[PDB]
Tab-separated table of C-alpha atoms in Angstrom:
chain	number	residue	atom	x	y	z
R	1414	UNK	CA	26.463	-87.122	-3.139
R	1415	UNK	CA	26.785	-85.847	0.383
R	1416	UNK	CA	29.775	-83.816	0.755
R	1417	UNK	CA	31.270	-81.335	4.103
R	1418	UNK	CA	33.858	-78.903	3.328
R	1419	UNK	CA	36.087	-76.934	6.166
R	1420	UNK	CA	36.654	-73.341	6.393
R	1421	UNK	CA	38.813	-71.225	8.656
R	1422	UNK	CA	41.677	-69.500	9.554
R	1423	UNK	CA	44.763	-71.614	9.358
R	1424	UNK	CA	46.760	-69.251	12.041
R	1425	UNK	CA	45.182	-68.504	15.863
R	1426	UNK	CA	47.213	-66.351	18.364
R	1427	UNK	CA	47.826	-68.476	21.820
R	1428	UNK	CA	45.067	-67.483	24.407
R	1429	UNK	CA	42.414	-66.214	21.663
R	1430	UNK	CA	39.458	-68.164	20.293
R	1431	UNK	CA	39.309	-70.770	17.145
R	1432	UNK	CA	36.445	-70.935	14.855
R	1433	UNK	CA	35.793	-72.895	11.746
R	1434	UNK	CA	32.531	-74.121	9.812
R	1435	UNK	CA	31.578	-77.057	7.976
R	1436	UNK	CA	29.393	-76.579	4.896
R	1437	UNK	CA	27.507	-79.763	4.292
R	1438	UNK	CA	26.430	-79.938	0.608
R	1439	UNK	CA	23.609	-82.546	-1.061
R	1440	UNK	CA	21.606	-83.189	2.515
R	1441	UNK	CA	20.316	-81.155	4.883
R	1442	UNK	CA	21.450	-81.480	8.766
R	1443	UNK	CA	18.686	-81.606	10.532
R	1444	UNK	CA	17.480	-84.785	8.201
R	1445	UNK	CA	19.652	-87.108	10.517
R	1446	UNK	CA	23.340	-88.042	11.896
R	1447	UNK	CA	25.659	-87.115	13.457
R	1448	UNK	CA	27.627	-84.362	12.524
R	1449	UNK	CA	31.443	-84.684	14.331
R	1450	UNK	CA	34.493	-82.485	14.786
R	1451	UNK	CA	37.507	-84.776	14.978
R	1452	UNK	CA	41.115	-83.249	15.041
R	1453	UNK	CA	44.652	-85.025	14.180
R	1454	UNK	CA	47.764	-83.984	15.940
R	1455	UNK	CA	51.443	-83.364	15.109
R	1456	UNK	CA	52.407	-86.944	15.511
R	1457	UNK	CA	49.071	-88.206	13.713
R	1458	UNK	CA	47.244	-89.130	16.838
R	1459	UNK	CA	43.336	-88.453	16.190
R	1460	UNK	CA	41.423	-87.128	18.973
R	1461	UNK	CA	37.288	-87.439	18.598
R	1462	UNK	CA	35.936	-83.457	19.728
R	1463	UNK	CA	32.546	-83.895	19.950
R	1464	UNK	CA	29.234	-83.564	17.473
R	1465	UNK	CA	25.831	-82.035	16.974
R	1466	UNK	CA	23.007	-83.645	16.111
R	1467	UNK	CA	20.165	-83.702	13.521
R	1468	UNK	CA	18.281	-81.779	16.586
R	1469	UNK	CA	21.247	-79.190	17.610
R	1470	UNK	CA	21.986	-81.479	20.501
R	1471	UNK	CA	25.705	-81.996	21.460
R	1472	UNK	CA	28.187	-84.069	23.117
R	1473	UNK	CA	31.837	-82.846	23.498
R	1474	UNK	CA	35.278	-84.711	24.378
R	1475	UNK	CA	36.079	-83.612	28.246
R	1476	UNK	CA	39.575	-83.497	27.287
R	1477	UNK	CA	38.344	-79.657	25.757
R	1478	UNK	CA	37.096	-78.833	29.075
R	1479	UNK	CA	34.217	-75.884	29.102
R	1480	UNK	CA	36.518	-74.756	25.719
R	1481	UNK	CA	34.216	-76.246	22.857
R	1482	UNK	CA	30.904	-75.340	21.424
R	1483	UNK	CA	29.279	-76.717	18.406
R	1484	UNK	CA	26.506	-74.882	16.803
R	1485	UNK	CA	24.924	-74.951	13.528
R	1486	UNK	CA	22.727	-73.492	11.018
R	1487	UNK	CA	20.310	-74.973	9.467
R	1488	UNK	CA	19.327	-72.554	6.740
R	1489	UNK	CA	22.999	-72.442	5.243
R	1490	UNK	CA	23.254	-76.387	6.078
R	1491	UNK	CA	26.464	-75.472	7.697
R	1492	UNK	CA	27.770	-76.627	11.365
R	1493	UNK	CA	30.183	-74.978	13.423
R	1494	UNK	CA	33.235	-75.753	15.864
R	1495	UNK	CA	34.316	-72.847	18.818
R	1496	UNK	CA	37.203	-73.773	20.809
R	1497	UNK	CA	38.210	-70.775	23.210
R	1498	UNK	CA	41.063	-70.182	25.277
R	1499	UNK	CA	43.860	-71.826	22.399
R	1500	UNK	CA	47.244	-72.632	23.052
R	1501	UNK	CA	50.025	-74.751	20.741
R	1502	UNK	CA	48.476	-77.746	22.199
R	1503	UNK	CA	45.467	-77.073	19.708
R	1504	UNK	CA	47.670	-77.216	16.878
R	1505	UNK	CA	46.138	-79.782	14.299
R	1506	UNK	CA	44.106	-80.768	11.097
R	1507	UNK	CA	40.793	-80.099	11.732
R	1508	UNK	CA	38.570	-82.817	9.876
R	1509	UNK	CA	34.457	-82.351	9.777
R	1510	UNK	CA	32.748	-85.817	9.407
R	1511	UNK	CA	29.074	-86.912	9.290
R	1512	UNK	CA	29.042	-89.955	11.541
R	1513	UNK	CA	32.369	-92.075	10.878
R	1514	UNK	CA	31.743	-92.733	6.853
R	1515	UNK	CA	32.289	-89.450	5.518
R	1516	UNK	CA	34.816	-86.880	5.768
R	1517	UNK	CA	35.924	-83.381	5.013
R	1518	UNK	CA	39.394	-83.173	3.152
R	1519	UNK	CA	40.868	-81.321	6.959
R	1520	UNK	CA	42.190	-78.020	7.665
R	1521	UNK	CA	45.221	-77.277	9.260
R	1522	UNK	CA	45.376	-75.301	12.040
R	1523	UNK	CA	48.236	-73.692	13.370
R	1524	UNK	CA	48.120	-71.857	17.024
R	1525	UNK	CA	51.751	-69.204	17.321
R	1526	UNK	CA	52.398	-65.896	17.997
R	1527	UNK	CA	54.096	-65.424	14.702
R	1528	UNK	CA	52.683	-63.512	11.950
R	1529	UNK	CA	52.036	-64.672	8.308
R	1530	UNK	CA	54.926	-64.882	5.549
R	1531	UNK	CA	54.734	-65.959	2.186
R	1532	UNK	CA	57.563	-68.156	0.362
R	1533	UNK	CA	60.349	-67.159	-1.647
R	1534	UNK	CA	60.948	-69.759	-4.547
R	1535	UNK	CA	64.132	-71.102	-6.213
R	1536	UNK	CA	65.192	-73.324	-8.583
R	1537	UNK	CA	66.386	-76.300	-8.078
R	1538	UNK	CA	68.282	-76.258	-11.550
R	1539	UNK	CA	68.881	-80.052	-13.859
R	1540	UNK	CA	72.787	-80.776	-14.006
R	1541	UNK	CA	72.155	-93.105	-17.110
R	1542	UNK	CA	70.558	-89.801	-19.279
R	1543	UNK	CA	68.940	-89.151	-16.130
R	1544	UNK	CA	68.414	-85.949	-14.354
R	1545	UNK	CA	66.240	-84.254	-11.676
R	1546	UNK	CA	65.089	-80.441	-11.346
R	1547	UNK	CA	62.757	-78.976	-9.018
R	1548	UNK	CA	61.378	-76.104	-6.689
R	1549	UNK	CA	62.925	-75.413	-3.101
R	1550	UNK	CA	59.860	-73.443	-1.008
R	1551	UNK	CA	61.362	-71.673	1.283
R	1552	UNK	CA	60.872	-69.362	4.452
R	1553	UNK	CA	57.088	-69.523	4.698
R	1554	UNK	CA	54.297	-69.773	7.865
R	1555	UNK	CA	51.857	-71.439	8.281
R	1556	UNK	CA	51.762	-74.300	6.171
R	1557	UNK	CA	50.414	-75.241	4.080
R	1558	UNK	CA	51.808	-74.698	0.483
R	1559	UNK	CA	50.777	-76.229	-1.933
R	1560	UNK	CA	52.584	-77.125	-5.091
R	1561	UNK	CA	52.083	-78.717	-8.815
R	1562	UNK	CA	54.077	-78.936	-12.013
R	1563	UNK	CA	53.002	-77.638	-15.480
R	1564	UNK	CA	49.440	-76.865	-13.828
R	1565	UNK	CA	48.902	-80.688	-13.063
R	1566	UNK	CA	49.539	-81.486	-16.468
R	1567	UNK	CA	53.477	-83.396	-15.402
R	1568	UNK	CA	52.718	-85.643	-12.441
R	1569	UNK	CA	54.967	-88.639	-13.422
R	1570	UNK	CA	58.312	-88.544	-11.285
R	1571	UNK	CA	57.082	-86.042	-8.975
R	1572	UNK	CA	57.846	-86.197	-5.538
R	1573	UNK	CA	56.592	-83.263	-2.966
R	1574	UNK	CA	58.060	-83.546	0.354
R	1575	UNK	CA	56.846	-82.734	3.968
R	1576	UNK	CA	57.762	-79.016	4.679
R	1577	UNK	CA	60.366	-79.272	7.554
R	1578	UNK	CA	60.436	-76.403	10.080
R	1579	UNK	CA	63.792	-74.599	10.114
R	1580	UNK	CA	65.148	-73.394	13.984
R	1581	UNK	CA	63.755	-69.404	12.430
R	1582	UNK	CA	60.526	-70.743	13.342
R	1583	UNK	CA	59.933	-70.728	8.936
R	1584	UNK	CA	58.573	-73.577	7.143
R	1585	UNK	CA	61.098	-74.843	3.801
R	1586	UNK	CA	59.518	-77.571	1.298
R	1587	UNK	CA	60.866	-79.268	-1.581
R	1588	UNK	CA	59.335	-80.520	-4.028
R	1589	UNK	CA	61.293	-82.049	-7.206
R	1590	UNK	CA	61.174	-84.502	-10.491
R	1591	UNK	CA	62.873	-87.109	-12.352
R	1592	UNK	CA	63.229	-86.078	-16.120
R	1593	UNK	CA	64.741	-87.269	-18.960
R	1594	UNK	CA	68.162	-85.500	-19.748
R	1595	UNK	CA	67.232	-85.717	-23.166
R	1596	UNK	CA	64.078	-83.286	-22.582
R	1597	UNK	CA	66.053	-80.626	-21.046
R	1598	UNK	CA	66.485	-78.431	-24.240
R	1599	UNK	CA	63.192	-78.595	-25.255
R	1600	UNK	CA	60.960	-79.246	-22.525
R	1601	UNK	CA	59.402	-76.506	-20.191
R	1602	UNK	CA	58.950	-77.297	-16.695
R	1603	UNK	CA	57.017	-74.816	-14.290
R	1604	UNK	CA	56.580	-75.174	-10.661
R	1605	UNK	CA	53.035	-73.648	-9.483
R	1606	UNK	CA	53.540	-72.801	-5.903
R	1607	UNK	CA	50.352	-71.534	-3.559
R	1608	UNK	CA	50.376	-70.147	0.009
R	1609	UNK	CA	46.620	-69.557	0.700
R	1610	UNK	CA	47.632	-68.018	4.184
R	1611	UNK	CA	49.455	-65.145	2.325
R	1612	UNK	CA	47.492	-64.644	-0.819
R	1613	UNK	CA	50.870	-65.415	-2.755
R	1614	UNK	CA	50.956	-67.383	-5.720
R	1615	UNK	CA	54.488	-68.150	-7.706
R	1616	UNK	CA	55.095	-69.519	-11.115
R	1617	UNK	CA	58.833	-70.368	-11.089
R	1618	UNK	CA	60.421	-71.773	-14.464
R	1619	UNK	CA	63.313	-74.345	-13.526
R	1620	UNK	CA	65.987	-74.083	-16.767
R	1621	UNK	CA	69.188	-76.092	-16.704
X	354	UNK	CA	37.380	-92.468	29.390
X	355	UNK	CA	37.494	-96.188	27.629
X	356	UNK	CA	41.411	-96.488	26.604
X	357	UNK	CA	42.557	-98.018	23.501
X	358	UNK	CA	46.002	-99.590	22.752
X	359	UNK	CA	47.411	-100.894	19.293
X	360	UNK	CA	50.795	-102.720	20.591
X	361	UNK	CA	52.144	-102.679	17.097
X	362	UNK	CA	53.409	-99.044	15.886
X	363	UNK	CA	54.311	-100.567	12.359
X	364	UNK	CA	54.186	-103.886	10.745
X	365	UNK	CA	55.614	-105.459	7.901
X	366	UNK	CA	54.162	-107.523	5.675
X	367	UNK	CA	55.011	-109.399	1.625
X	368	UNK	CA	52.033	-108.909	-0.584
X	369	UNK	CA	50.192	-111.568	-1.449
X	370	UNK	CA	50.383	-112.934	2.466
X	371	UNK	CA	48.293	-112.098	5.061
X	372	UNK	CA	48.556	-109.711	8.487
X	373	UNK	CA	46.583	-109.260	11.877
X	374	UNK	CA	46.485	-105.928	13.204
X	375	UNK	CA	45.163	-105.851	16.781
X	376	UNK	CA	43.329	-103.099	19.238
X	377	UNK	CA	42.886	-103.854	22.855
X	378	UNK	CA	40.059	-102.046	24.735
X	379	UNK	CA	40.214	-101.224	28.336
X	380	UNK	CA	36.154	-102.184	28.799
X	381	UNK	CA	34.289	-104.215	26.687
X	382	UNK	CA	32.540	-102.761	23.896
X	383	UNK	CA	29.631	-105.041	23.469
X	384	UNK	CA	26.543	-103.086	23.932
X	385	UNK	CA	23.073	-104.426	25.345
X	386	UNK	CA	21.659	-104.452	22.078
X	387	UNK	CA	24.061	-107.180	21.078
X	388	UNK	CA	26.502	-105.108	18.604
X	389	UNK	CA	30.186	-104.206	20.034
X	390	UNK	CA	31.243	-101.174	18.918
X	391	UNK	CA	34.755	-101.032	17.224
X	392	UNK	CA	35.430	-99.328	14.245
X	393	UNK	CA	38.413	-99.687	12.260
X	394	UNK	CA	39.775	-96.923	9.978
X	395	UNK	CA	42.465	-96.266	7.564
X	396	UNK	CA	44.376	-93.431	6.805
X	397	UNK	CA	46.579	-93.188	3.347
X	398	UNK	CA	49.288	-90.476	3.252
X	399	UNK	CA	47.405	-86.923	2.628
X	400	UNK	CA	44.253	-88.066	2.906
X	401	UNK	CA	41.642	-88.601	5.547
X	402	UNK	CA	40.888	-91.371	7.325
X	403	UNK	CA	38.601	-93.860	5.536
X	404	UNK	CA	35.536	-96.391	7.870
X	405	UNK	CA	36.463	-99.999	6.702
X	406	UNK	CA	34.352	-101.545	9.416
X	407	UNK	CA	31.701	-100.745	11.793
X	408	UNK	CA	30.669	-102.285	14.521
X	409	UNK	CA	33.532	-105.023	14.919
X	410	UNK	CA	32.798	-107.073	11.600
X	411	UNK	CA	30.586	-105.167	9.288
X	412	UNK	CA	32.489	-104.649	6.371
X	413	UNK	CA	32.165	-100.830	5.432
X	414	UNK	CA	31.373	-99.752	1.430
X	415	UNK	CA	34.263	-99.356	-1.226
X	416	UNK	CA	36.460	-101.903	1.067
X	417	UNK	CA	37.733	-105.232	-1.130
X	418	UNK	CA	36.461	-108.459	1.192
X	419	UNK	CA	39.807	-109.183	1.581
X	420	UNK	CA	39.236	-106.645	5.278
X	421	UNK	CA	37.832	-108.718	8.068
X	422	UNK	CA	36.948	-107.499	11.284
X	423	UNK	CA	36.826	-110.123	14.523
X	424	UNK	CA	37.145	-110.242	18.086
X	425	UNK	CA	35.363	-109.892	21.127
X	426	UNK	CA	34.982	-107.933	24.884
X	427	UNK	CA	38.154	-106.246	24.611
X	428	UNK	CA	40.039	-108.016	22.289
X	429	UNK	CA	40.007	-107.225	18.486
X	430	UNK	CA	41.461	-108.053	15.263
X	431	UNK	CA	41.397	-106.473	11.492
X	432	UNK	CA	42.827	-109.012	8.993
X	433	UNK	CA	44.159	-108.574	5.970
X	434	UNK	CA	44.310	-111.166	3.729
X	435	UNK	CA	46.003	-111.159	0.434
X	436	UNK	CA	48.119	-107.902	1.100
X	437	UNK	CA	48.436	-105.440	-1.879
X	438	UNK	CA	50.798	-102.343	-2.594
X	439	UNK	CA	48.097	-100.212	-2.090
X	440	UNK	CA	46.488	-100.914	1.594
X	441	UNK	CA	49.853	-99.013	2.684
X	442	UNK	CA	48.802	-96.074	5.506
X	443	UNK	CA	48.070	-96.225	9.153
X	444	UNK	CA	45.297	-98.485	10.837
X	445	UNK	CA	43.187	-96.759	13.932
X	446	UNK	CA	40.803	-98.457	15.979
X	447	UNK	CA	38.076	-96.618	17.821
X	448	UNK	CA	35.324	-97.209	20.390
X	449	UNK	CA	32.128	-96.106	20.007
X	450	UNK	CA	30.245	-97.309	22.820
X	451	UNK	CA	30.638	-94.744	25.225
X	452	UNK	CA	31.231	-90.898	24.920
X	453	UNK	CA	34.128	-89.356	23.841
X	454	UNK	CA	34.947	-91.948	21.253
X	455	UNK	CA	38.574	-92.913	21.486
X	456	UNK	CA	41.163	-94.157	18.838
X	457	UNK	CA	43.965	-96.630	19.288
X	458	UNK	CA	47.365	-95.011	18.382
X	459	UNK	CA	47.590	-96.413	15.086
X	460	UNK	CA	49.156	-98.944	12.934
X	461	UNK	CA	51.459	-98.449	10.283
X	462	UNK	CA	51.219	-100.961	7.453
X	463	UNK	CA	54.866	-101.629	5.977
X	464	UNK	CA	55.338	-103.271	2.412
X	465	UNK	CA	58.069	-106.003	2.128
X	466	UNK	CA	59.832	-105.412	-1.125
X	467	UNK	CA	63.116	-106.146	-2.831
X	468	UNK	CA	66.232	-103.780	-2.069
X	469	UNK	CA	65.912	-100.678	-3.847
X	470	UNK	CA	69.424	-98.243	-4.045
X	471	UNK	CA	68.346	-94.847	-3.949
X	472	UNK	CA	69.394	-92.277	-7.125
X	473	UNK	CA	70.760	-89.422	-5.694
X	474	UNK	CA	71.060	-85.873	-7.065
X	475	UNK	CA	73.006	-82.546	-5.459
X	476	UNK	CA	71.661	-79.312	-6.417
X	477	UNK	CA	74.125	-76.157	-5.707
X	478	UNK	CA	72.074	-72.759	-4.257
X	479	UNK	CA	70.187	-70.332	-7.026
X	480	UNK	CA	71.790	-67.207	-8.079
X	481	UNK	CA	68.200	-66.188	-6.764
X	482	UNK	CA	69.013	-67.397	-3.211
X	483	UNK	CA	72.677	-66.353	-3.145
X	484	UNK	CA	70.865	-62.552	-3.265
X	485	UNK	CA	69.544	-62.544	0.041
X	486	UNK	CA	72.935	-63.592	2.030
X	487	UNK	CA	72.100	-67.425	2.872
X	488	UNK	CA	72.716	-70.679	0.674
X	489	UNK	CA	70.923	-74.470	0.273
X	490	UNK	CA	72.309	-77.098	-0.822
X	491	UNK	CA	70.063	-79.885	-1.877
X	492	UNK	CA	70.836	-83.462	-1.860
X	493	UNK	CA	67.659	-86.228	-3.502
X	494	UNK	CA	67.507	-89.307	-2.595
X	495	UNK	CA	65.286	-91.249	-4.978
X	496	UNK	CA	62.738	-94.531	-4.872
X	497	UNK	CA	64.899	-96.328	-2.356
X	498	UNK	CA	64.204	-99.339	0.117
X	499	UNK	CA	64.245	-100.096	3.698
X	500	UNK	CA	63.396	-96.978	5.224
X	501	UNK	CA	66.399	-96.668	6.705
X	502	UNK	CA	69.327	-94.071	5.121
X	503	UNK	CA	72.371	-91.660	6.044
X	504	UNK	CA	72.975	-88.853	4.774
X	505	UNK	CA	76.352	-86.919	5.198
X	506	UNK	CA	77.296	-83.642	3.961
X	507	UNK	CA	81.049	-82.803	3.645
X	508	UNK	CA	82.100	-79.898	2.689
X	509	UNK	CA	86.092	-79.243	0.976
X	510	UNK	CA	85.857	-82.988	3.191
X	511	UNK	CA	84.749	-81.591	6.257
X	512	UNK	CA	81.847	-83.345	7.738
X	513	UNK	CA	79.525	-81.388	8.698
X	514	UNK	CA	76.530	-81.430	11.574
X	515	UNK	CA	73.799	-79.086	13.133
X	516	UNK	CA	73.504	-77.504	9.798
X	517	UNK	CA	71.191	-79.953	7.409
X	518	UNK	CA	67.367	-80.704	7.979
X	519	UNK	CA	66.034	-83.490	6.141
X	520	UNK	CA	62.568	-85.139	5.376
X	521	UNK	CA	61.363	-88.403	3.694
X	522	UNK	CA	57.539	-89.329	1.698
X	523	UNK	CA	55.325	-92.006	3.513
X	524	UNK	CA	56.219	-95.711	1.213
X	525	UNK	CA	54.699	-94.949	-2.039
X	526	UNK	CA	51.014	-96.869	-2.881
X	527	UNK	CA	52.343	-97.712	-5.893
X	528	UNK	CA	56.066	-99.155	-6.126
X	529	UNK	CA	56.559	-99.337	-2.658
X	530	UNK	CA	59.584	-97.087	-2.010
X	531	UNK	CA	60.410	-94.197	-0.108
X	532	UNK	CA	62.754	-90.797	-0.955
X	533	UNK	CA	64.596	-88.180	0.497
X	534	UNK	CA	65.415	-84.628	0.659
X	535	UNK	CA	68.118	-83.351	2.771
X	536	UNK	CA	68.459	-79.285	2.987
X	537	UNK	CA	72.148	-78.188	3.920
X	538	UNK	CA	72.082	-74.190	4.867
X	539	UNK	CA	74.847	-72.147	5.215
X	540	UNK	CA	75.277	-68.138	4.918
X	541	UNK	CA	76.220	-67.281	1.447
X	542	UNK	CA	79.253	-66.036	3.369
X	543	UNK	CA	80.445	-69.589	4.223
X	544	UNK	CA	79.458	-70.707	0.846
X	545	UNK	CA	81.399	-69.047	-1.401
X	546	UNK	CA	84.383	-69.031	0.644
X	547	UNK	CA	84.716	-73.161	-0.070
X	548	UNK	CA	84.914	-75.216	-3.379
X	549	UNK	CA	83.902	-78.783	-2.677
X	550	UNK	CA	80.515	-79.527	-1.856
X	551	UNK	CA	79.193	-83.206	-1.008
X	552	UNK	CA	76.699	-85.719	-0.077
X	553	UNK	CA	77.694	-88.807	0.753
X	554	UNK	CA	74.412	-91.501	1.190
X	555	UNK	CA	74.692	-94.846	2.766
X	556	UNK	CA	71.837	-97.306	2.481
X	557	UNK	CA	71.822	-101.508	2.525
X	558	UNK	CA	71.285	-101.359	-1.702
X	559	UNK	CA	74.692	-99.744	-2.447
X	560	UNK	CA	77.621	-101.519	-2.746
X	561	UNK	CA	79.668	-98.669	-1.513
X	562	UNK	CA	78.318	-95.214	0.549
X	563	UNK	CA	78.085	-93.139	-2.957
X	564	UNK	CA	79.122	-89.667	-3.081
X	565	UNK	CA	77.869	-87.066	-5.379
X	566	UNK	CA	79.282	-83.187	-5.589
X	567	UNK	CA	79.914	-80.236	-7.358
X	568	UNK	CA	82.777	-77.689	-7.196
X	569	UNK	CA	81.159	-73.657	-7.010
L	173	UNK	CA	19.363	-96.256	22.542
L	174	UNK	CA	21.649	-97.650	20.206
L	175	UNK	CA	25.431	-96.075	20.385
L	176	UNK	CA	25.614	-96.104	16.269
L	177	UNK	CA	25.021	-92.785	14.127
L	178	UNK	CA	21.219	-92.222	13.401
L	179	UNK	CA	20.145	-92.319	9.727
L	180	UNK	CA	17.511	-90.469	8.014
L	181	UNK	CA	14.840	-90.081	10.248
């Protein structure tokens, strides 16, 4: 089945230029539709870019000014979004589509002058026979992080929260589950955190 | 550029009944060719937006038949009937008669449930933390409903403010509830130079605000 | 002519 995937840098510097590619897999582009850029704001508000066509040919959102270009390649099936001249105002998920019925999974991308820092990780340690344990994510940019329990294997109970962004300008995330007191003593419980931004990757085991 | 407006930010509904979202255009979208071109999409937390109908009533693939698009010029309607758990997320509308293509603001689709207290847990800062000179304090609120909760932190009974950050899941697909974390930070400092630490949660399915804590 | 996405051509 027809699928696009983005790729991209998830942090631009204000004033510099923003790139990212679609790779369509299971149909070529120049066999028909169109083939859209669509971005969704802090706030959720969608905002349609532009597209290229089947034939290269392009129409663009005059919101972006003389800022976007979309250009493809048909050899690597992949399609390609330039917006120059970027400011916070570009800040956004970045979603590839082919016409409106399907859609790329997004890519965030975040336009600051700060550099890139990876998380620190700390337990969030278990104290009805109910308890709770989790992961607090903290001090991190960009986002996204993602994070899983037991490498997907414990997903019942789990509840990941939105990453708020603390006044240092750092992300923090929790992320946390509802257990059984009676598995405490017996029952290992991992927290698989990933920043793809920084390359780090942290395995933190939460013990009461 | 065409303008579209969705009046409604949010709406509320009991499953099993049905709801009207509406999208108001600022041209008419009906095209020469006879079609009018309004799309309705969905959006479910984390995920993108999904096509439920094209062209004003055409009823887009993997959508149950309880979605129905009508309306007409510059008027529009998606109907629901026969609400479930699960069509939870945000409604957009967008034009596609006319370059750029423009989306309404968005719907948010509520669930109507029964009063749900939320279980709440306090989690004292890691030994891990403590290392590097600042301290959280964690306070979960779990599987509660309405939306709407307060969240105090005291600490040896002083109520504190400016210092916590807190953030809340979209209402869950599934049992229709929402939760809470709330992140009080202090320098390690200020931490260990106090002994009580609280959070005290208020919300419609408690018979009392409840308080838990823990003494460092 | 027609404002909809193209198919396979």
């Amino acid at each position: 089945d027809v699928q696009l995937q983005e790729s991209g840098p998830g942090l631009v510097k204000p004033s510099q230029s923003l790139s990212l590619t679609c790779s369509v897999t299971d149909y070529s582009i120049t066999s028909g539709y169109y083939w859209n850029w669509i971005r969704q704001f802090p706030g959720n508000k969608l905002e349609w870019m532009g597209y290229i066509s089947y034939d290269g040919s392009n129409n663009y959102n005059p919101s972006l000014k003389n800022r976007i270009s979309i250009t493809r390649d048909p050899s690597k099936d992949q399609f390609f979004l330039n917006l120059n001249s970027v400011t916070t105002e570009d800040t956004a998920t970045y979603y590839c589509t082919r016409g409106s019925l399907v859609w790329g999974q997004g890519t965030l991308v975040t336009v600051s002058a700060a550099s890139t820092k990876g998380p620190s990780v700390f337990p969030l340690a278990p104290s009805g026979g109910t308890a709770a344990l989790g992961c607090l994510v903290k001090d991190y940019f960009p986002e996204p992080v993602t994070v899983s329990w037991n490498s997907g294997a414990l997903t019942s109970g789990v509840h990941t929260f939105p990453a708020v962004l603390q006044s240092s300008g750092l992300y923090s995330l929790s992320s946390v589950v509802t257990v059984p007191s009676s598995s405490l003593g017996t029952q290992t419980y991992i927290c698989n955190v990933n920043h793809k931004p920084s390359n780090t990757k942290v395995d933190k085991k939460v013990e009461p | 550029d065409i303008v579209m407006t969705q009046a409604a930010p949010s709406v509320p509904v009991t499953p099993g009944e049905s709801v009207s979202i509406s999208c108001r255009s600022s041209k008419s979208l009906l095209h020469s060719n006879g079609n009018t071109y309004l799309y309705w999409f969905l959006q479910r937390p984390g995920q993108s937006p999904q096509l439920l109908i094209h062209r004003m009533s055409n009823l887009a693939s993997g959508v149950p038949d309880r979605f129905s698009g009508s309306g007409s010029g510059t008027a529009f309607t998606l109907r629901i009937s026969r609400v479930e758990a699960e069509d939870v997320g945000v409604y957009y509308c967008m034009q596609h008669l006319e370059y750029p293509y423009t989306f309404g603001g968005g719907t948010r689709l509520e669930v109507k449930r029964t009063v749900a207290a939320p279980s709440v847990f306090i989690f004292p800062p890691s030994d891990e933390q403590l290392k590097s000179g600042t301290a959280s304090v964690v306070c979960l609120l779990n599987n509660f409903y309405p939306r709407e909760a307060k969240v105090q932190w005291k600490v040896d009974n002083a109520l504190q403010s400016g210092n916590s950050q807190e953030s809340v899941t979209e209402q869950d697909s599934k049992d229709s509830t929402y939760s809470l974390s709330s992140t009080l930070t202090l320098s390690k400092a200020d931490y260990e130079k106090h002994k009580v630490y609280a959070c005290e949660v208020t919300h419609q399915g408690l018979s009392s605000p409840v308080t838990k804590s823990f003494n460092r | 002519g027609s404002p909809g996405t193209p198919g396979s051509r």
